[PDB]
Structures are given as C-alpha cells and as structure tokens.
Amino acid sequence: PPCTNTTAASTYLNNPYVRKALNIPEQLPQWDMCNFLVNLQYRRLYRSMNSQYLKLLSSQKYQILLYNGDVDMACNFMGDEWFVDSLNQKMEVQRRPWLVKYGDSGEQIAGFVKEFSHIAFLTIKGAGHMVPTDKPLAAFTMFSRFLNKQPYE
Amino acid sequence: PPCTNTTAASTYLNNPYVRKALNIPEQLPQWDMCNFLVNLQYRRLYRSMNSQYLKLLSSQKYQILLYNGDVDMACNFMGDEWFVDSLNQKMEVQRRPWLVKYGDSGEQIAGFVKEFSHIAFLTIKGAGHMVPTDKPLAAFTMFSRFLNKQPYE
Amino acid sequence: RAPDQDEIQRLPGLAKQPSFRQYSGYLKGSGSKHLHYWFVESQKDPENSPVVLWLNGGPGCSSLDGLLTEHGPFLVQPDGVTLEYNPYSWNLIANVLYLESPAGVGFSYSDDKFYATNDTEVAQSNFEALQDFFRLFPEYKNNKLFLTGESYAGIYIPTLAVLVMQDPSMNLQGLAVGNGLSSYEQNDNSLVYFAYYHGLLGNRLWSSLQTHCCSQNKCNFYDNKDLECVTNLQEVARIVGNSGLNIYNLYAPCAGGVPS
Amino acid sequence: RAPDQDEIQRLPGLAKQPSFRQYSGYLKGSGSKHLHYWFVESQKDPENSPVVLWLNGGPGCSSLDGLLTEHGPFLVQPDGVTLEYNPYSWNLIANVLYLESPAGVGFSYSDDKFYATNDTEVAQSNFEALQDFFRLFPEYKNNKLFLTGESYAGIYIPTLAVLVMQDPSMNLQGLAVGNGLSSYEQNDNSLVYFAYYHGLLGNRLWSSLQTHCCSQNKCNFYDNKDLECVTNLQEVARIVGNSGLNIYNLYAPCAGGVPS
Ligand SMILES: *[C@@H]1O[C@H](CO)[C@@H](O[C@@H]2O[C@H](CO)[C@@H](O)[C@H](O)[C@H]2NC(C)=O)[C@H](O)[C@H]1NC(C)=O
Ligand SMILES: *[C@@H]1O[C@H](CO)[C@@H](O[C@@H]2O[C@H](CO)[C@@H](O)[C@H](O)[C@H]2NC(C)=O)[C@H](O)[C@H]1NC(C)=O
Ligand SMILES: *[C@@H]1O[C@H](CO)[C@@H](O[C@@H]2O[C@H](CO)[C@@H](O)[C@H](O)[C@H]2NC(C)=O)[C@H](O)[C@H]1NC(C)=O
Ligand SMILES: *[C@@H]1O[C@H](CO)[C@@H](O[C@@H]2O[C@H](CO)[C@@H](O)[C@H](O)[C@H]2NC(C)=O)[C@H](O)[C@H]1NC(C)=O
Ligand SMILES: Cc1ccccc1[C@H](CC(=O)O)NC(=O)c1cc(=O)n(-c2ccccc2F)[nH]1
Ligand SMILES: Cc1ccccc1[C@H](CC(=O)O)NC(=O)c1cc(=O)n(-c2ccccc2F)[nH]1
C-alpha cells in the first residue's frame, strides 16, 4: 500500500530461522505484507454491513465496538459514526469524550464515544488507520474497557 | 491561556540576572507571558481587516502572506482561507501542495498554497496555533520563500 | 490439550523469553485451504482470559502486521532483526489469535494454489478455521470469544460473526472493528467532506462539488452519474491518494517521499 | 549608528556566544509608553538582510514567547535555565525585531501606568515605536521592512501597515500573518464546521445547529439571534474551549490535564 514502509516486518518474517521457529514449510514462497494477486482476484460482494449488524444486535447477546482513528482518510471516522447512528438502536447516550491517564501528563481526552444499547462508536484522537501503532495506550485502554464491558469514558 | 505551559519562559525571564542582561529596570513588576489586565481593559474596534488589506493591495508594492496551522481551533485555517479568497484579487492560481525537504525522509507535503496577485494563503499541515514551535523546518522554508518573494511550492 | 507441534520454543530477535506460551501453525479452512495462525496466550491468567481473533484487511493483507507493528506482545524494530516487548500489547489481558486470511496471504496457502475468492467464501473458510482452532485448543472452547479486525475486516468480522452466532458451542461475546469498511456509500460521501474540512481541497473544487454532486441539503459523492461530478471526484481521488499525502495518517510523512 | 546602551553582552543560559549582535531596550510609543524590544541581527549579512517586526497576539501577550519558544535564535529548555540554539531560527536570513506591545505587556510600561487601550491607539503607538527603532538603528532605514505577527496580530499588523505605507522613509516590502484574526464572522462560522468535521461534535448537535442556525445553503454561527442557535453554539464553545481539548493544537495534550 502507498506511503507505508513494511520492510522491517518483511525483513524479519523472511529470515529462514524465523520461518523455522514459526513452523513454516520451506517450499512456501516469500512473505509479503499484502498479497497483490489475492486482492486482484478478490470478488467484493457486500456494499453495506447494515443487515449483518442488525442480525447480531437482534439477539442482544453481543457487545459491538466500531473504533476509528480520526486522522485516517482510507476508512475515516465520520463514515463509521454515520453507520452506527443509522442502525437506530435503543438506549442512545449523549456523545461524550473518553479519557486516558498518560504518565505524568495527567488525564487527557483520547477521543469521543457515541453509545447505544449493545453498540458504541469511538474516535481515537490523533490516530490514523493503525490505531494501536499511533496511540498504543489509548488503544489498550479502549480494548480493556471493551473486553470487560466497561463504559469507555 | 488554557492548555498552555509557559513556566519555562516565565522562569527564565523572571531570573534577576536575565533582566539585567536584557537591560530591564529593577522596579518593573514580574514578567507574565500574557497580561490579563491589558486584555480586560482592551477595547476591540475592528471586526474585519477587509478594508485594511484592500488598501495595502491597491498600491501593488507589498507581498502579503496569511499562513495557518491546520490543527489550530483558536484561529482555524478555513476562516483565513475564506478571508483571502473573499478579497477577490487578480492572477488567481490553482490551489497546490507546497513541499519541504526533510532530512533523509525526502520531499513531503508541508501544506497547501492558494495564490493571487501580491497575496497568498498557506496551510501548515500538522501545525497548531504556534506554527514555528510545531513545524520549525516548514515555518523556516515558508519564511525564506516569503522574504525572497519566491513561490511557496 | 494443545498442539505441541505448533508451539514456538525460541523466537529470533527476542532478548528475553516470553512469560506466556505462543503457537504458530495451520488452521484448516474450506476445501484445501491451510490458514497460518500465530496464537499468543494471555500474559495474565490465560485459562480464564478471553479468546480474541484478529484480522487485518486489504483484502490480501497479513494479520502478522497486527502482531509485529500494531498490538502484538513484541514489535519489530527498524533493523528488522530486533523484537522489543510492547507494554500496551493486547495479550496482557487476552489470548490473541492472529489469522493470515484468506489463503495465499503471507504464510497461508492452498493445495491447488487457487487463490480467487469472495466475501461469502472467506467468511465460511474463517469459520472452519475457528472450528479447527477449538479442536486444536479444546481448553479454550468455553472461554469468552471476541472477533476483532481492521479496515476490510469491517466486512470479514460481521459476516464471520453471523456464522459464529449460529454455532452454540462458540461462546461469542462481542466484536470490535477498527477503521473498518462498513458501507462504501457512507465512506465515500464522508471522505469528500473529510478532505475539504481538513484543507486538502480548495473553495473552487468544493463549490464545483457542491453544485454538481449535491441537491438541496443532501450530497451524492458515491454513485453520482453527473458529468462534472465524476471529473471533480477523480480530482479529489488524485489529491487524497495520489499527491503524496499519507492516506492512512494525514499528519504523518509519506514513506519514500512524494512521488515524481 | 546603534544604541550601545541596549546591546546584550552575555546572556545567561547560553553555552556558546552568538555570532550575531543582539539588543534589548525600549522604543518610545505614543504618550508616555515605553515598549520593550529584543532585536536579533541576521546570522548571515545583517547589513543587507531584511528588517522583520514580530508581534504576538492576545491582546496582552508577549512577543518574547515568539523568540524563546517559536522562531528565535535560541529556545528556552524545560529547566527554564538552559537556552539552546535553534537551527530553524528566523534570524538566519533576517534582522528580527520582537516588540512587547501594547504598554504593560511583559517588560513594556508607561509612566502613568494607564494600560487601557484600543486597536487605533496600538497601531499609532507601534508606528511611533517603529520610527524610534529607525532613529536608534539608522543603518537599517533603507533595508527591506516586513511586518509579521500571530493571532490577534491579524489586527495589529494590517492596521500598522496602513500607517507605515503612508511613511515614504520606511521601505515596507510586505506582511505575514500566522493563524491570525482577520474576520470575527469568518473565524466563528468556520470553527463550528471545523469542530464537527474533526469529530468533536456529534450528529445530534450538528443536526440541531444546521436546523436552527442555517438557511438553505448558508449558515450563521456568528451573529444569529435564534433561541436554540445561541444555546447550541454555547455547547460548541464548551466542547471546543472548556472540555479539556487543546484549542491551540487539537492533537496535542492539554498542559495540566483535563479540568475538574
Ligand atoms: C524503510 O524501512 C526500513 C526498515 O525500517 C529502513 O531501513 C533501516 O534504516 C535505518 C537507518 O538507516 C537502519 O538503522 C536500519 O538497519 C534499516 N533497516 C533495514 C532492514 O535495512 C528504510 O530506511 C526505510 N525506507 C524509507 C524510504 O523510509
Ligand atoms: C464465491 O466463491 C465460492 C467458492 O469459489 C462459489 O461457490 C462455488 O461455486 C461453484 C461454481 O462456480 C460450485 O461448483 C460450488 O459448489 C460452489 N461452492 C459453494 C460452497 O457453494 C460462489 O459461487 C462464489 N460467489 C459468487 C457470488 O461469486
Ligand atoms: C510545566 O512546565 C515546566 C517547565 O518546563 C515543567 O517543569 C519541569 O519539569 C521537568 C520534569 O520534572 C524538570 O526536568 C524541569 O526542571 C522542570 N522545570 C521547572 C522550571 O520547574 C512542569 O512539569 C510543567 N507542568 C505541567 C503540568 O505540564
Ligand atoms: C482609543 O484610545 C485613544 C487614546 O486613549 C482615544 O483617543 C483620545 O481620546 C481622548 C478622550 O477620551 C482625547 O482627549 C484624546 O485627545 C484622544 N487622543 C487621540 C490621539 O485622538 C480614542 O478615543 C479611543 N478610541 C475609541 C473608539 O475608544
Ligand atoms: C495499510 C496496511 C499496511 C499493512 C498491512 C495492512 C494494511 C491495510 C489493511 C489493514 O489496515 O488491516 N491495507 C490497506 O488498507 C489496503 C488497501 C489495498 O488495496 N491494499 C493492498 C492489498 C493487496 C496488495 C496491495 C495493496 F495495496 N491494502
Ligand atoms: C496561546 C499563547 C501562548 C503564549 C503567548 C501567546 C499566546 C496567544 C497569542 C499568540 O499566539 O501570539 N494567546 C492567545 O491566543 C490568547 C487569547 C487570550 O484571551 N489570551 C490571553 C490574554 C491575556 C491574558 C490571558 C489570556 F489567556 N491569549
């Protein structure tokens, strides 16, 4: 993909001793971050996940989280905020900022949370496409709150 | 001002030996980054700089530059881009990105330039309110091109 | 209890041995597909910690990117030799299953080498791979299952979750999608607005977009048939993804510099 | 030729002596105003380099912030003792005049201690200060003059430039304004749009703003008399500048943390 440097991971995973430690059969071709041939041959079928999410929310057994880094342009935060809102779920909560405790810098706004029953949309302020790479502490805090079914604030 | 830490500059300028080196009379009160009493007593008279800029542009003797860090919310880039465009000047050029050569990272987009005759609007990508603090190299490159009356691209 | 054939004993580039158990092998997908997985057990109480599946997007990109560059227990350094422990690793509180999917992605493969696939096929193949994971790791069958992913996994995860929800043996508790593709229409419409309000497009291009793509208060930047609209959206596409701006992080530099 | 009374000999916190000459003293403004200046000569050919005036905004904030934290020859370190040379200093190619203005700002003062002022008074006082600078530094009279500034200096600079343009002795060549206040209307209207498209406001607050502040295609977030509009704009004002977000850099932390 453009503007990305994948050399470090590519150099590591293509090392023969790394492949042996990872139990990779020797005959297999070299490791590429993204397989161009798979992408080219891939037939995209769905245009919207609306029905899939409504099917998952109907059971009321699953906690759903859609999180976006607000400085990403590939899959921007607004597209996903609109999507979550369009699902029109019960128990709509007022949009609020969510906090993260940074070392000695104190409590900081890590982004904004829009919550409904069994579904929440989250922004990660200053993060791009790869949220845990850009904001690792904010990504962990969000992940921890998601697993434990805790409010994101 | 909120969310700003001015302690380092305040600690330095309030040192008695610094004041002596700067030829400051000893009787004068302590140095404050922003004087609250001056702000409180200040009477704001102008609501727009439209007439001032049109008066300066009428002579065709001066090069005008309005530059904004695109992540600032106090005096955001769009307000100033609208302003420059609203002046409706001759020799309108197509909006283009402007480049900066970073160490070994190569040529990067430092922002976008909107040029007219004797006036140009510039964004500084990733910079806030204090452009030279956040993007010093991009700020110097822009400043150098401005003084030398060179295109910003 | 666990596949001892798949367990990683000593991983190169690590200065310290992991406190947790880790596995690297193959899960059986649909037909003749063998999906490479890298499973990292929880650093704190793996037996009671949730099982989390991680899928990277593309389509065609590896979930090993997620491990070594995003939220894995160790991260690859610029030398491409050294791995350094991540203090914000997702495996601190969860058993994380990174799956290279579909077949052909990274170390994943198929016996027929036929890698032409679709959304429905990938969901079914990922479901069969999940069934195979629980066969190889029976001690994790009753553990809380979470399906997570990024980008195109916005399609991978909900389609997979609909199949998982029909399996009573799988303890599905939830799903998380990072910067995911949920709707092509919503993504394309919001991006044009994102590009203008982030100062990438000027008032001239925006006025032309608002006049030729929009009606009253609503805008169509997705499937608009208007002549100038297609031309203007192509200029936006050139500015956003082909001018030298990093589409993945607007304020980050573009690796390799601005193109010629 | 130059005020030797004002020249800085040895500045504390500097590990190396400057290659350029620097001055710190007072310029006479209007009435009984004494404006403190810090003039840093060009590092490369000061005699032919342009004269650049720098003004910080507020109103009431010091131009010494611009020197020690922004684009000065040396920058104050977190210890508040050490000064480190700036390789991107604006004085590498220009003679930079940092002026603490109006009276009362930083080290600037007035003999009557009366600091109540206005836009027209500050412009006239800054013009008299500029005339005083050329009296103290006659060797710079014929040098290219540039008037620069930040924030409220978006008012300071163009008002000053209109007075400077009427003086034939001043070699005015141009003006540069950084994140400046050019129009209250344009700034306020654009900020509401900036806050929504940067994900600070939700669809509920935005829909309410678009319905109660806007008509057809045009929006009024500046002087709107509408009831809910004033209420909604006050909520925007609370989110943007009073919630814990850094108004000066959206993606930077708020110094001192989020308020109680
Ligand atoms: C792309 O990434 C690679 C790997 O991170 C970069 O190469 C490294 O460069 C540094 C500095 O010269 C060295 O210390 C590392 O040892 C290099 N690693 C490898 C594997 O060669 C490379 O410079 C980057 N390229 C661009 C254009 O950004
Ligand atoms: C998605 O891919 C699957 C697998 O390649 C397709 O399903 C197979 O289609 C062939 C005919 O082309 C049949 O012989 C197989 O029996 C099908 N398999 C299954 C499991 O149904 C499927 O048609 C593709 N979908 C689309 C819309 O292209
Ligand atoms: C505000 O700024 C001051 C000055 O930069 C900070 O104080 C410094 O803290 C570091 C780390 O503890 C010390 O090495 C410096 O010597 C301190 N300088 C001074 C002058 O005390 C202070 O921590 C900052 N406060 C906040 C809330 O961000
Ligand atoms: C801006 O401030 C100036 C100076 O304080 C005001 O001008 C003076 O006004 C007093 C009366 O209040 C007169 O006695 C002086 O002769 C005026 N001086 C000059 C130079 O004109 C001015 O009125 C203020 N402007 C506004 C609109 O408040
Ligand atoms: C940006 C990136 C880097 C490394 C790994 C994955 C990705 C992402 C997916 C993710 O965030 O999980 N990739 C893309 O956004 C993307 C779009 C696209 O067309 N590709 C791609 C796929 C196969 C071959 C080349 C490609 F560029 N990759
Ligand atoms: C943000 C800042 C820090 C340090 C110095 C100046 C400033 C800026 C002005 C500039 O960028 O040049 N200040 C403001 O934006 C600002 C608005 C405002 O009300 N003040 C202010 C003025 C006097 C007293 C307290 C203040 F907060 N300061």
User: Which amino acid belongs to residue A74?
Assistant: A
Closest CA to C104 of C113, C95, C96: C113
The CA distance from D243 to D247, in Å, is 10
Distances (CA, A) of C207 to B68, C135, C229, D215: 22, 59, 11, 17
- Closest ligand (CA of A37): 5
Residue of A84, A147, A138, A76 whose CA lies nearest to A111: A138
Give how far Cα D16 sits from Cα of B14, B23, D10, D74, Å.
22, 20, 10, 11
Please, what is the end-to-end C-alpha distance for chain C in angstroms? 56
CB distance B7 to D25 below 8 Å: no
**What is chain C's Cα-based Rg?**
21
Task: State the CB neighbour count (10 A cutoff) for residue C234.
Answer: 10
Distance CA D192, CA D236 (A): 7
Asked if B78 lies within 8 A of C199 by C-beta distance, the reply is: yes
Report the neighbours of A using a cutoff of 3 or more CB pairs below 8 angstroms: C, D
Q: Which residue, B122, B128, B131, B124, is CA-closest to B151?
A: B122
Query: What is d(CA C61, CA C102) in angstroms, rounded to the nearest whole number?
Result: 9
Cβ atoms < 10 Å from Cβ of D216: 7
Whole-angstrom Cα distance, residue B90 to residue D93?
A: 30
CB contact (8 A) between residue A144 and residue C79: no
Q: CB neighbours of B116 closer than 8 A, spacing ≥ 6? A: B84, B87, B89, B90, B91, B92, B93
Q: Which numbered ligand comes closest to the C-alpha of C124?
A: 2
Q: In which element (H, E) is residue D65 found?
A: helix D64-65
**Terminal-to-terminal C-alpha distance of chain A:** 34
- Angstrom CA distances, D223 to A62, A80, C72, D184, D228, stand at 47, 33, 52, 10, 13
Q: Which residues contact C3 (CB under 8 A, 6 or more apart)?
A: C23, C25, C136, C137
Encode burial over B45-74: b for 16+ CB neighbours within 10 A, e otherwise.
Answer: ebebbbebbeebbeeeebbbbbbbbbbbbb
Residue C68 main-chain phi, psi, to 5 deg: -75, -15
Helix (H, G, I), strand (E, B) or coil at A116: strand
Tell me if C121 CB under 6 Å of ligand 2: yes
How many other C-beta atoms are found inside a 10 Å radius of the C-beta of residue D157?
Answer: 29
Q: List beta partners, residue C12.
A: none
Method: X-ray
Q: Where are the domains of chain D?
A: 1-260
d(C-alpha C236, C-alpha B95), whole Å: 12
Helices and strands, counts by H and E, chain B: 7, 4
Question: C103, C84, C123: which is closest to C37 by C-alpha?
Answer: C103
d(Cα D177, Cα B64) in Å, to the nearest integer? 8
- What gap in Å lies between CA A122 and CA A152, rounded to an integer? 8
Q: Is the peptide bond preceding residue D253 cis, with omega within 30 degrees of 0?
A: no
Contact D228, D208 (CB under 8 A): yes
Q: For residue B74, what are the CA distances in angstroms to A62, A109, B130, C198?
A: 42, 18, 11, 15
Q: Which of C115, C94, C91, C95 is nearest to C103 (CA)?
A: C115
All residues at 6 or more sequence positions from B120 whose CB lies less than 8 Å from its CB, including other chains: B64, B65, B66, B84, B113, B114, B152
Residues B112-124: b if buried by 16+ CB within 10 A, e if exposed: bbbbbebbbbbbb
Residue D130 burial (C-beta neighbours within 10 Å; 0-12, 13-18, 19+)? buried
Task: Count CB atoms within 10 A of the CB of residue C135.
Answer: 12
CATH tag, D1-260: 3.40.50.1820
Ligand 2 test: best mutation among C110, C120, C128, C155, most atoms within 8 Å of CB? C120
Contacts of A105 by beta carbon, 8 Å cutoff, 6+ apart: D253, D257
**Chains C, D: CB contacts under 8 A, how many?**
11
D183 lines ligand 4 (CB under 6 A): no
Count Cα atoms within 13 angstroms, Cβ side, for C12: 16
CA dist C241 and B78 (Å) reads 22
C contacts of B81 (beta carbons < 8 Å): 199, 202-203
Residue B97 β-bridge partners: B112
Which residue's CA is the nearest one to ligand 5's atom 16? Answer: C58
Q: Are strands A96-102 and C172-178 parallel, antiparallel or unpaired?
A: unpaired
Who's near B26: CB < 8 A, 6+ residues apart?
A: B19
The CA distance from A78 to C194, in Å, is 8
DSSP state of B48: B
Q: Which two tokens stand for residue D48?
A: 């032919």
- Domains of chain A (ranges plus CATH)? 1-153 (3.40.50.12670)
Amino acid at D255: A
DSSP letter for A34, please. B
Measure D258 CA to nearest chain A CA, in Å.
6
Chain C interface includes D194 (CB < 8 A): yes
**Does ligand 3 have an atom closer than 6 angstroms to the CB of B8?**
yes
Question: Which amino acid residue places its CA nearest to atom 17 of ligand 6?
Answer: D58
Cβ of C80 below 6 Å from ligand 1: yes
Could you give the CA distance from residue D41 to residue B81 in angstroms, rounded to a whole number?
Answer: 33
What is the dihedral angle through the alpha carbons of D194, D199, D204, D205, rounded to the nearest 10 degrees?
-40
Given phi > 0 = left and psi -120 to 50 = alpha, else beta, which region is B111? left
User: If you search the block for the tokens 């005008």, which residue do you land on?
Assistant: B64
Q: Where are the alpha helices (DSSP H) in chain B?
A: 7-13, 16-21, 36-41, 50-58, 77-86, 131-134, 136-147
Inspect the interface and report whether the beta carbons of A75 and C151 lie closer than 8 Å.
Answer: yes
3-class state of residue B141 by DSSP? helix
CA distance B63 to D19: 30
Query: Does ligand 1 lie within 6 Å of residue A4's CB atom?
Result: no
Phi, psi dihedral angles at D41 (to 5 degrees): -70, 155
Tokens representing D180?
């400046």
Which residues in chain C are closer than 8 Å to D211, comparing Cβ atoms?
none
- Find the angle CA(C174)-CA(C180)-CA(C186) to the nearest 5 degrees: 115
